[PDB]
Amino acid sequence: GSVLDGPYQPTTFKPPNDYWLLISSNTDGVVYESTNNSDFWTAVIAVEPHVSQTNRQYVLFGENKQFNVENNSDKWKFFEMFKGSGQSDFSNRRTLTSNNRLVGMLKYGGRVWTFHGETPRATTDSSNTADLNNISIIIHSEFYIIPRSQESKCNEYINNG
């Protein structure tokens, strides 16, 4: 608990480099929208347990977007939708399956890192960006900030709540 700075209310801001944002989702839909409007876009979308394959409609980066989602599990799913250029389609780059309902985002070096997989064995991987410092995030939920050096405790929160 000594590494948690928060909770903060839903916020639009430029997150600092070298901190995990630990974002607490309390409903289905858009959890956050992050972009630099050049080479990096990520949105995370929450889907509640026991959702039969379906199209759902969202608003991402000011646009109406349809995504095909499925959650036949008893856990929440958090679908990471990525694109690397303005005109590209989104891809479901990674998913987190979790009833802890926390997602993580870290800006570090030339990459943005997140958690994926199924709790309690969720792990991290990354997207590249050549413009880390123009990333703005719209966070639709409460969140906490954890220094990158304390990632082991962030991992524990993702995996255990």
Query: Per-domain residue ranges for the chain?
Result: 4-161
120 prior amide bond cis, ω within 30:
yes
Beta bridge partners of 30: 45
Which residues lie closer than 8 Å to 134 by C-beta, 6 or more apart?
36, 37, 38
CA dist 79 and 151 (Å) reads: 21
Residues 44, 50, 53, 55, CA torsion sign: negative
Resolution in Å, one decimal, please: 1.2
CA distance 158 to 119: 7
Cα dist. 140→5, 60, 62, 94, 101 in Å?
Answer: 18, 12, 14, 20, 13
How far apart, in whole angstroms, are the C-alpha atoms of residue 145 and residue 4? 6
**In this structure, is the dihedral angle defined by the CA atoms of residues 132, 133, 136 and 137, taken in order, positive or negative?**
positive
Pick from 108, 141, 138: which is nearest to 26 by CA?
A: 141
Neighbours of 97 (CB within 10 A): 17
14-19 CB contacts, 8 Å cutoff, 24+ apart: 14/133, 14/135, 14/136, 14/137, 15/105, 15/107, 15/135, 15/137, 16/107, 17/107, 17/108, 17/132, 17/133, 18/106, 18/107, 18/108, 18/147, 18/148, 19/106, 19/107, 19/145, 19/146, 19/147, 19/148
Q: Which tokens belong to 15? A: 């997150």
Instruction: Yes or no: say if 78 and 98 are a contact pair by the CB < 8 Å rule.
Output: yes
Give Cα 34 distance to the centre of its chain.
Answer: 9
